[PDB]
Amino acid sequence: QLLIKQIRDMRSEHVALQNQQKLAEKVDRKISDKDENIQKTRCMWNTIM
Amino acid sequence: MVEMIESQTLLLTYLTIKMQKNLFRLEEKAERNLLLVNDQKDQLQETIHMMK
């Protein structure tokens, strides 16, 4: 009985999370430029300071 | 009187051996079923964690 209850609860949780991932991937293609933007910003500050 | 007690002992002993054999078979089937379900639980838990 315990195991039945636990599996049911987890299945419900898995569906909820799948709906949230589908909304987030429509935004991400452009990530290949992060480390480069951070270093660029850091460099600009260092130059000013 | 000694013959009667021996007959009782025979009945009880027979019942006992018969019950024990059938109980061991159930326990083994039960534990197998629990392990199978537990394994399913474990796979779902890992997938949920990765998504989170």
What tokens appear for B40 in the block? 């399913």
C-beta separation of B31 from A3 below 8 A = no
Q: Give me the helices (H) in B1-52, please.
A: 2-51
Contacts of B47 in chain A (CB under 8 A): 14
Chain A CB within 8 Å of residue B30 CB: no
Total length of chain A: 49
Phi and psi at A44, nearest 5°, equal -65, -35
User: Which residues fall within 8 angstroms of residue B38, CB to CB, at 6 or more apart?
Assistant: A3
Round to whole Å and give the CA distance between B20 and B40.
31
Is B41–A10 a contact, with Cβ atoms under 8 angstroms apart?
yes
Q: In chain B, which residues have their Cβ closer than 8 Å to the Cβ of A11? A: 44
Could you tell me if B48 and A13 are in contact, meaning their C-beta atoms sit under 8 angstroms apart?
A: yes
CB pairs under 8 A between A and B: 25
CA-based nearest distance B36→chain A, Å: 11
CA-based angle B30:B36:B41, to the nearest 5?
125
Residue with tokens 């990765």: B50
Residue A27 has φ and ψ, to the nearest 5°, of: -100, -25
Could you tell me the resolution of this structure in angstroms? 33.0
> Where does residue B29 rank: exposed (0-12), middle (13-18), buried (19+ CB within 10 A)?
exposed
State how far the Cα of A25 lies from the Cα of A23, in Å rounded to an integer. 6
Are A3 and B37 a contacting pair, CB within 8 Å? yes
